[PDB]
Amino acid sequence: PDREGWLLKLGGGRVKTWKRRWFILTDNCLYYFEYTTDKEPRGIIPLENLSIREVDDPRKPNCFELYIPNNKGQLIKACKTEADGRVVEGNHMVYRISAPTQEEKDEWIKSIQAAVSVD
């Protein structure tokens, strides 16, 4: 793992709520878990063909988003796990994330940008 840490992630549909998740950046893939020691990830996000951009949020600090450039409306390819264990495709067009400090933000971006390239 090149980087791991707690981050708040925005999810839901109509009402979007922030969830604290444990992220693990590892070779072209960004995983996230509910608990720091869980064996199976709550989500896997392949980084190929994605970019990051900082964004401003009204309720949360140090945010940034994973997104598909020039997106005409497609969803980010990713797998997700359901409370019943069933695996399904992610339903995000973008992943908005909140880092605890501005420093953790720049590190995560630098780490992720570098993880999207040489692969």
Ligand X SMILES: O=P(O)(O)O[C@H]1[C@H](O)[C@@H](OP(=O)(O)O)[C@H](OP(=O)(O)O)[C@@H](OP(=O)(O)O)[C@H]1O
Q: Output the CA torsion sign for 30, 50, 58, 73.
A: negative
Q: Determine contact, residues 19/95, Cβ cutoff 8 Å.
A: no
In one-letter notation, the amino acid at residue 15 is V
Please report how close the Cβ of residue 106 comes to ligand X at its closest, in angstroms.
Answer: 23
For ligand X, the binding residues in 10-69 under the rule CB under 6 A are 11-13, 17, 19, 21, 42-43
Which region, judged by CB under 6 A, interacts with ligand X, from 8-16, 59-67, 68-76, 106-114? Answer: 8-16
Bridge partners, 94 (sequence order): 67
Token pair for 56: 């401003």
Residue choice 91, 101, 102, 117 for contact with ligand X (CB under 6 A): 91
Binding site for ligand X (CB under 6 A): 9, 11-13, 17, 19, 21, 42-43, 80, 90-92
